[PDB]
XYZ file of C-alpha atoms in Angstrom:
297
model
C 117.890 110.316 106.029
C 117.540 109.115 109.774
C 119.493 105.941 110.169
C 116.489 104.059 111.387
C 114.303 104.899 107.937
C 117.414 103.702 106.071
C 117.275 100.630 107.723
C 113.725 100.411 106.994
C 114.142 101.500 103.424
C 117.035 98.621 103.269
C 114.330 95.896 104.394
C 111.470 97.098 102.082
C 114.402 97.154 99.203
C 115.343 93.897 99.792
C 111.915 92.382 99.609
C 111.106 94.604 96.565
C 114.133 93.254 94.607
C 112.880 89.776 94.615
C 111.081 89.108 90.928
C 107.736 88.179 92.120
C 105.860 87.093 89.108
C 107.963 83.894 88.771
C 107.211 83.066 92.611
C 104.149 80.670 93.478
C 101.486 82.329 95.427
C 102.732 81.227 99.070
C 106.328 81.738 97.962
C 104.906 85.333 97.636
C 103.114 85.086 100.829
C 106.629 83.939 102.544
C 108.603 86.603 101.260
C 106.262 88.889 102.834
C 106.650 87.274 106.218
C 110.405 86.824 105.960
C 110.436 90.869 105.560
C 108.684 91.223 108.788
C 109.976 88.258 110.468
C 113.016 89.688 112.339
C 110.963 91.862 114.650
C 109.319 89.589 117.148
C 106.181 89.640 119.329
C 106.811 91.444 122.776
C 106.796 88.561 125.505
C 104.004 90.383 127.510
C 101.353 90.217 124.493
C 98.690 87.687 124.870
C 97.304 86.348 121.706
C 94.419 83.627 121.150
C 93.530 81.905 117.649
C 89.676 81.516 117.259
C 86.796 81.195 114.935
C 84.388 84.477 114.623
C 81.377 83.411 112.740
C 83.637 81.066 110.744
C 86.314 83.511 110.073
C 89.740 82.595 111.305
C 90.858 85.495 113.826
C 92.945 86.332 116.426
C 92.811 88.501 119.553
C 95.956 90.201 120.354
C 96.111 92.495 123.449
C 98.581 93.791 125.926
C 98.301 93.949 129.911
C 95.787 96.299 131.100
C 93.881 96.369 128.042
C 90.234 97.238 128.250
C 88.159 93.952 127.413
C 85.079 95.891 126.105
C 86.993 97.785 123.517
C 87.670 96.294 120.151
C 89.635 97.293 116.894
C 88.609 94.910 114.299
C 91.526 95.074 111.898
C 92.076 94.364 108.194
C 95.614 93.255 107.079
C 97.034 94.271 104.139
C 98.805 92.614 101.159
C 96.842 92.960 98.049
C 94.081 90.732 99.466
C 96.618 88.067 98.189
C 99.349 87.839 100.737
C 99.539 89.054 104.547
C 97.812 87.468 107.635
C 98.434 87.623 111.278
C 102.039 86.550 110.974
C 102.775 89.678 109.111
C 100.897 91.962 111.039
C 100.721 90.867 114.795
C 103.579 92.583 115.972
C 102.129 95.939 114.881
C 98.789 95.395 115.657
C 100.341 94.596 119.365
C 101.612 98.058 119.438
C 98.208 99.647 118.178
C 96.662 97.587 120.940
C 98.970 98.560 123.646
C 98.773 102.197 122.501
C 95.014 102.363 122.408
C 94.415 100.282 125.697
C 91.917 98.160 123.780
C 91.928 94.507 122.375
C 92.858 94.015 118.621
C 90.369 91.152 116.928
C 92.555 90.570 113.831
C 91.106 88.701 110.954
C 93.022 86.082 108.862
C 90.252 86.974 106.182
C 89.883 84.837 102.620
C 92.763 85.385 100.701
C 92.768 85.532 96.488
C 93.162 83.683 94.362
C 91.640 80.860 96.343
C 88.816 83.011 97.772
C 88.319 86.057 95.622
C 86.206 89.005 96.058
C 84.285 89.941 97.572
C 85.248 87.468 100.272
C 86.841 89.598 102.381
C 83.986 92.113 102.504
C 81.722 88.727 103.992
C 84.408 88.013 106.246
C 84.465 91.338 107.819
C 80.902 91.572 108.302
C 80.687 88.227 109.711
C 83.188 89.075 112.360
C 81.499 92.440 112.846
C 77.979 90.675 113.466
C 79.877 88.148 115.815
C 81.237 90.807 117.941
C 77.610 92.188 118.352
C 76.146 88.902 118.881
C 78.685 88.302 121.747
C 77.700 91.547 123.429
C 80.395 94.114 122.095
C 78.902 97.724 121.814
C 79.305 99.275 118.215
C 80.240 102.437 119.932
C 83.291 100.407 121.440
C 84.289 98.909 118.136
C 86.546 100.493 115.469
C 87.825 99.065 112.441
C 91.269 99.433 110.917
C 93.426 98.279 108.175
C 96.493 98.823 105.876
C 96.617 99.331 102.031
C 94.116 96.414 100.482
C 92.837 96.344 104.523
C 92.550 100.131 104.499
C 90.385 99.888 101.379
C 88.488 96.696 102.812
C 87.769 99.102 106.215
C 85.864 101.482 104.051
C 83.849 98.915 101.563
C 83.144 97.040 104.989
C 81.499 99.993 106.521
C 79.670 100.556 103.496
C 78.408 97.104 103.534
C 77.193 97.131 107.153
C 75.489 100.269 106.459
C 73.863 98.742 103.295
C 72.438 95.789 105.538
C 71.147 97.705 108.306
C 73.837 96.906 111.078
C 74.494 99.474 113.542
C 77.594 101.229 112.540
C 80.947 101.076 114.392
C 82.454 103.942 116.069
C 85.192 104.605 113.740
C 87.249 103.616 111.015
C 91.499 103.802 110.651
C 92.807 103.334 106.963
C 96.631 103.096 106.737
C 98.074 103.813 103.416
C 94.623 102.504 101.842
C 94.230 101.285 98.634
C 90.749 101.801 97.275
C 91.146 101.592 93.387
C 91.571 98.350 91.534
C 92.829 100.174 88.397
C 95.561 102.612 90.168
C 94.366 105.673 88.614
C 95.865 107.962 90.934
C 98.446 110.541 89.810
C 100.701 109.732 92.410
C 101.358 106.267 90.614
C 103.074 108.477 87.831
C 104.896 111.285 89.928
C 105.740 108.995 93.030
C 106.962 105.760 90.876
C 110.706 106.410 91.616
C 109.845 107.947 94.967
C 108.246 104.965 96.404
C 110.432 101.674 97.305
C 107.651 99.587 97.930
C 104.364 99.702 95.727
C 104.258 100.587 92.243
C 101.381 100.220 89.711
C 102.740 97.127 87.661
C 102.315 95.300 91.449
C 98.951 96.632 92.257
C 97.845 95.621 88.917
C 99.107 92.142 89.966
C 97.215 92.095 93.387
C 93.957 93.332 91.415
C 93.933 90.955 89.071
C 93.943 88.190 91.381
C 91.427 89.635 93.770
C 88.506 90.671 91.201
C 88.506 87.036 89.461
C 86.925 88.855 86.657
C 84.566 90.807 88.219
C 84.206 94.573 87.505
C 87.464 96.460 88.728
C 84.918 99.510 89.621
C 82.948 97.492 91.590
C 82.382 99.957 94.729
C 83.130 97.027 97.175
C 86.383 96.454 95.502
C 86.793 99.847 94.725
C 85.433 102.076 97.280
C 86.384 104.866 95.165
C 83.020 104.443 93.683
C 81.248 103.662 96.578
C 78.184 105.413 98.426
C 80.380 106.925 101.651
C 77.102 108.414 103.187
C 76.509 107.648 107.004
C 80.273 106.332 107.776
C 81.652 106.782 111.211
C 84.860 109.360 111.602
C 87.825 108.317 109.678
C 91.549 108.543 110.694
C 93.526 108.166 107.091
C 97.391 107.882 107.452
C 99.601 107.658 104.316
C 103.406 108.505 103.341
C 104.171 111.629 101.128
C 106.287 109.306 98.801
C 103.737 106.742 98.318
C 102.329 105.608 94.823
C 99.081 105.175 96.941
C 99.411 109.042 98.223
C 96.341 109.983 96.062
C 94.037 106.971 96.996
C 94.205 108.210 100.444
C 93.711 111.844 99.229
C 90.969 110.587 96.796
C 89.242 108.560 99.910
C 89.723 111.574 101.983
C 87.812 113.902 99.706
C 85.040 111.483 98.840
C 84.257 110.909 102.525
C 84.069 114.620 103.341
C 81.712 115.250 100.240
C 79.719 112.493 101.776
C 79.587 114.337 105.324
C 81.873 111.837 106.889
C 84.416 113.119 109.479
C 87.759 112.117 107.744
C 91.234 113.308 108.925
C 93.900 112.766 106.605
C 97.711 112.949 108.034
C 100.143 113.295 105.267
C 103.649 111.667 107.008
C 106.865 113.207 105.231
C 109.428 110.842 103.833
C 107.674 107.741 105.101
C 107.201 104.524 102.807
C 104.005 102.359 102.368
C 102.272 101.211 105.838
C 105.647 102.259 107.807
C 103.591 101.885 110.995
C 104.694 98.075 110.156
C 108.418 98.901 111.666
C 107.507 100.643 114.486
C 109.669 98.327 116.575
C 112.727 99.988 115.010
C 111.152 103.321 113.545
C 110.459 106.497 115.571
C 108.077 107.553 112.865
C 106.083 104.306 113.092
C 105.981 104.455 116.874
C 104.655 108.311 116.580
C 102.132 107.274 113.759
C 100.645 104.403 116.018
C 100.548 106.782 119.008
C 98.560 108.917 116.942
C 95.979 105.930 115.845
C 95.890 105.289 119.992
C 94.974 108.990 120.348
C 92.307 108.703 117.926
C 90.827 105.438 119.053
C 90.735 106.238 122.477
C 88.635 109.580 121.528
C 86.491 107.330 119.469
C 86.032 104.035 121.371
C 87.410 105.445 124.737
């Protein structure tokens, strides 16, 4: 009922109103860009496009950034849409809050390049960091929705191929279950203005390219989470993805991982995206900054 929240909900509903199933993939991508395009990058943010082991990526950082601390970021958008164009402003807020550099990946999207391309890209990028002298103890992975699941999957993959693990993971409204079996997909169906089971199914079919929906790297709900670094998980109380965040946290703790779950009342899917215009978004990002400062600081 805050005016700021009302405004965010309005922007979300305007996008969510448009029939996406009749749109070309690129029109769906652009529709996402359109929603977020009204919030410009601060004038003092530095960015640079580059390839990291072949993956298109972008440095994003505010003045006074510690150049040795890196938040490797995986954007959301169902593994189908999203990019630094949609995510760079939020990332600049996190960068500034954490006092670190962000390295955001424009990782391979489906249907052009389906699962497990994003996991491969995340590993390639992390290997690039290590090859260029960044210390695992000063690197954290982060991601929202699809990217949030990808953080977990990438961490498991890295352990499986014997890479030194990074210091932490951050998951924002993580999507960890291709089949959308979480009960909140039923109970929060009318509470959640952004995300519903239909749309998730749409993304999963495109991401999977016919592969097993329960594959641990697509659905880390089924992955071995042993040995992962401390996780911060944020999610909104009205989200259909609420149970994905809870299930991830429960499974991580059972695996002996240090996982902290924050359920933010009344907040929509990836509300941190609207930090420039939403107090709760700035508050949540401040929390992320504190977590990163603790882990990679």
